Amino acid sequence: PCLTGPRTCKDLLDRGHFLSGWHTIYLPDCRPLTVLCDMDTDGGGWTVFQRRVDGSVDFYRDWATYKQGFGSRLGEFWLGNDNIHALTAQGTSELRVDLVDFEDNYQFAKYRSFKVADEAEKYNLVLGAFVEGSAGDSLTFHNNQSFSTKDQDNDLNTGNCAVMFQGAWWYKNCHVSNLNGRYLRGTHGSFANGINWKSGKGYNYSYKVSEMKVRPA
Amino acid sequence: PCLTGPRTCKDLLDRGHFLSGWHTIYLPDCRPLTVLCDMDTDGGGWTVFQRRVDGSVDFYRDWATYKQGFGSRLGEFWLGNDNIHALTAQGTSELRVDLVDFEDNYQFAKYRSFKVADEAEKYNLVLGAFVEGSAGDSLTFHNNQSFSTKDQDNDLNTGNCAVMFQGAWWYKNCHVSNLNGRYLRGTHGSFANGINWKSGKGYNYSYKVSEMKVRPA
Amino acid sequence: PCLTGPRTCKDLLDRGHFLSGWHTIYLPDCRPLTVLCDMDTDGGGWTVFQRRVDGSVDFYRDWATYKQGFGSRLGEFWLGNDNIHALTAQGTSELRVDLVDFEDNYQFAKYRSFKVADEAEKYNLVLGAFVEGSAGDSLTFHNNQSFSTKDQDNDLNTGNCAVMFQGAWWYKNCHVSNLNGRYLRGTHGSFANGINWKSGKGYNYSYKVSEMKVRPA
Ligand SMILES: *[C@@H]1O[C@H](CO)[C@@H](O[C@@H]2O[C@H](CO)[C@@H](O[C@@H]3O[C@H](CO)[C@@H](O)[C@H](O)[C@@H]3O)[C@H](O)[C@H]2NC(C)=O)[C@H](O)[C@H]1NC(C)=O
Ligand SMILES: N[C@@H]1[C@@H](O)[C@H](O)[C@@H](COS(=O)(=O)O)O[C@@H]1O
Ligand SMILES: N[C@@H]1[C@@H](O)[C@H](O)[C@@H](COS(=O)(=O)O)O[C@@H]1O
Ligand SMILES: N[C@@H]1[C@@H](O)[C@H](O)[C@@H](COS(=O)(=O)O)O[C@@H]1O
Ligand SMILES: *[C@@H]1O[C@H](CO)[C@@H](O)[C@H](O)[C@H]1NC(C)=O
Ligand SMILES: [Ca+2]
Ligand SMILES: [Ca+2]
Ligand SMILES: [Ca+2]
Ligand SMILES: [Ca+2]
Numbered sequence A, B, C: 001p002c003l004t005g006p007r008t009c010k011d012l013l014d015r016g017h018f019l020s021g022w023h024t025i026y027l028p029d030c031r032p033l034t035v036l037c038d039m040d041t042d043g044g045g046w047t048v049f050q051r052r053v054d055g056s057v058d059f060y061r062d063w064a065t066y067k068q069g070f071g072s073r074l075g076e077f078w079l080g081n082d083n084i085h086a087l088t089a090q091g092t093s094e095l096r097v098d099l100v101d102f103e104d105n106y107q108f109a110k111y112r113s114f115k116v117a118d119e120a121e122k123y124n125l126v127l128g129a130f131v132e133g134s135a136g137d138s139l140t141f142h143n144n145q146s147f148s149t150k151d152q153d154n155d156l157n158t159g160n161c162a163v164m165f166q167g168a169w170w171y172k173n174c175h176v177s178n179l180n181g182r183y184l185r186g187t188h189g190s191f192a193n194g195i196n197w198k199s200g201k202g203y204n205y206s207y208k209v210s211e212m213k214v215r216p217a
Helices: A009-014 A063-068 A081-088 B008-015 B063-068 B083-087 C009-014 C063-068 C079-087
Strands: A019-027 A032-038 A046-052 A093-100 A108-113 A114-116 A125-127 A130-132 A210-215 B021-026 B032-038 B046-052 B094-101 B108-112 B114-116 B125-127 B131-132 B209-216 C021-026 C032-038 C046-052 C093-100 C108-112 C114-116 C124-126 C131-132 C207-217
Touching: A009 A019, A009 A032, A009 A210, A046 A081, A046 A108, A063 A081, A081 A114, B008 B021, B008 B046, B008 B209, B046 B083, B063 B083, B083 B114, B094 B114, C009 C021, C009 C032, C009 C046, C009 C207, C021 C063, C046 C079, C063 C079, C079 C114, C093 C114
Parallel strands: none
Antiparallel strands: A019 A032, A032 A046, A046 A210, A093 A108, A093 A210, A108 A130, A114 A125, B021 B032, B032 B046, B046 B209, B094 B108, B094 B209, B108 B131, B114 B125, C021 C032, C032 C046, C046 C207, C093 C108, C093 C207, C108 C131, C114 C124
């Protein structure tokens, strides 16, 4: 069942599943996981690990909650740090970030490789080169940073980045992207605590849609 | 098939299903049923049997329709009275009611047990003690009453509550809650015919989101 | 699996699946396909093969992409010309087209039979009699015409209808319906390149919702 089953969303596309949606794959350790496949963007076959679309889910969550994953298949979610590690541990996944503003402008960024380490390495981000994208590069800054949540500060700032910027991320001191920030709906006077991508719409605009996704390259 | 399969949304959570969504459970008689699990609210592991979110579905329905269930897995639904009975017949399920107003403020009510009887007993409500909730108690009033729809009047009113308040419920003479009422979108001049919870926002305010859900005690 | 399994959304309804949403059916050759069932409209049991609702998906796509299907189970999609052929080849399906404008007026058209031929016959449209519908008949004009996309012109125009009208359809010279056109959101000055149904809201109005769906006649 593991040995016959699909291992990635790319396997599902290869087997004739052409519509984005939730499907079961088998992780390298043979555990089944139901994931969101994007078969429509940029050739299809992406496994989606983060999705924001309407502000229905609270993303200001603790370490245990980020570790296991949270949210809803009907809408917004974070798939979980243990899962994202399992998906990216071996071989090379590319990363794409898709963003939509409240005027329906679509922007994206793409990186050559993306891996997150295990819990003992604090889900350390190992990110390859910026390839291209109309949103510009707001992630290379975050290479080689631990993941941090409000109750576990692993950042390089003397304060608590997750609390200061009301999110959870691979904060440094502190960010140029904050896609797990608050769903603040376009322009906000609060500083850099929204769904922000600095090179895209800046530190005072919160996107309508965010998706982070991976595929074998 | 059934022997070791999950019996509730709580079993699924215990087995590592951390994302809300539609999953198959095996009812006490081993029939499979695809249900909506809420893995987030209040510890997670709730089986959701009513959901209102945008007024896309007509809830002013007849006895046969309430018996069978109606609506959409992608939006609003009533799971069905035969199914709700099968879910709650054996072994103490708690009830939670989650309500959201049009300014995104959340209120709730929780009850120590909840069951509905079979069709012959008119899906009679058997409700345990109010435990707590910021919405206040607007369901104890309905304890030990038959369900009624427009076309099957088992209420304690000389006329027809379901027609007068455009819903379906365990009406007495007539109600303090009406969550299968019309989707009237906030404050409404019309008396008590909306998605109303008397002790919450009162008889002239119709919530944006209603969910009714159960979990083993 | 196949000879006992459901063949259509109508079989699923007859077997007690009362909620709209995505389910597996078995095509005439026993291939499983996950499809969207509309268990409400006109008694229920329709298999939905096109859905537009918010302009999130690009429908200006090439022949290969129309052939396989594209979009998302979570929103807008085209189920795919090979699939639609398989669904409509044997046993005769009626067609219903559901349309909603931006003021929430609902209109429909219904045809007694609908089939599309295989790829070698360019997914030729074979349409039976108009039965009824408030949207009026804007599909008989397209009877017995090949499907065309921007990169494969099988139309009866000297130029390229798919390009001129920014869609994909059984174009003649060129159209009176264009439901795979651009999501232009109500009135538009551009001529006939939106989600248009001529006999409904005309060549300069793009509907909010369009669904195309089939059921055994
Ligand atoms: C990820 O970040 C860690 C810092 O947390 C980087 O570790 C540091 O790596 C540098 C080299 O890039 C180390 O410098 C070397 O130190 C010794 C002297 O102690 C010296 O012989 C060399 O001249 C060089 O300066 C640094 O010590 C090390 N720091 C720690 C605390 O381990 C790591 O390299 C970064 N990883 C990547 C892939 O960039
Ligand atoms: N097949 C059902 C019938 O069983 C039902 O009695 C009728 C009216 O239902 S109501 O909920 O709309 O009143 O509609 C549906 O077509
Ligand atoms: N893998 C597909 C190709 O097979 C397709 O021909 C091409 C253009 O598609 S279009 O619908 O966007 O024109 O992109 C897609 O990535
Ligand atoms: N132009 C079509 C014919 O081709 C068809 O034979 C007839 C009956 O079709 S029916 O599917 O609607 O029974 O209708 C219309 O006249
Ligand atoms: C419930 O109601 C009926 C009257 O409608 C009564 O005969 C019965 O004893 C009641 N049981 C309880 C616990 O109230
Ligand atoms: Ca810090
Ligand atoms: Ca009656
Ligand atoms: Ca009465
Ligand atoms: Ca031509």
